[PDB]
Amino acid sequence: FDLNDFLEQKVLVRMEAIINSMTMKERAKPEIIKGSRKRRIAAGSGMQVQDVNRLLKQFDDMQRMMKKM
RNA sequence: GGUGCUGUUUACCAGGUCAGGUCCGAAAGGAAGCAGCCAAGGCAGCGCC
């Protein structure tokens, strides 16, 4: 279960904007995304790093709730 | 080395285009620009010089 998936699922259009600013590898291995990449993605989708982390925060809980069934 | 071809490879770090999103604006409209893609580079094979 990756971010390509999480995508298939005003605050929603902005949640796509962010993933839309990532690369295939970042969607395939979210963990590889540290500060530098966060920065690239925030500016790339007119957001703020906090916003991204937020989106990253969600996927994590969503993924975590995927390793429980 | 250069050059052509082919395969491969490359988040951002003065290429181009720029979905999506963002910014400025009452608006008309401007602006920057991620991913992609094209280009360019890297690693190689073959040919040519």
What is the CATH number for A60?
Answer: 1.10.260.30
Tell me, in Å, the resolution of the deposited structure: 2.5
Q: Nearest-CA residue to the C1' of B20?
A: A17
- Find the nucleotide nearest A42 (Cα to C1′): B34
- What's the burial of A59, exposed, middle or buried (CB within 10 Å: 0-12/13-18/19+)? buried
Cα distances (Å, whole numbers) of residue A21 to A11, A17, A56, A67: 16, 6, 13, 26
Q: How was it solved?
A: X-ray
DSSP H helices, A9-48, are 13-19, 24-28, 35-44
Range of the domain at A17: 1-68
- Number of domains within chain A: 1
- Residue pair A56/A47 in contact (Cβ under 8 Å)? The answer is no
- Count other Cβ atoms within 10 Å, centred on residue A51: 18
Bases of strand B lying below 7 A from some protein CB: 11-12, 19-23, 32-36
CB distance under 7 Å to strand B: residues: A 13-14, 16-18, 20-25, 36-37, 39-41, 43-47
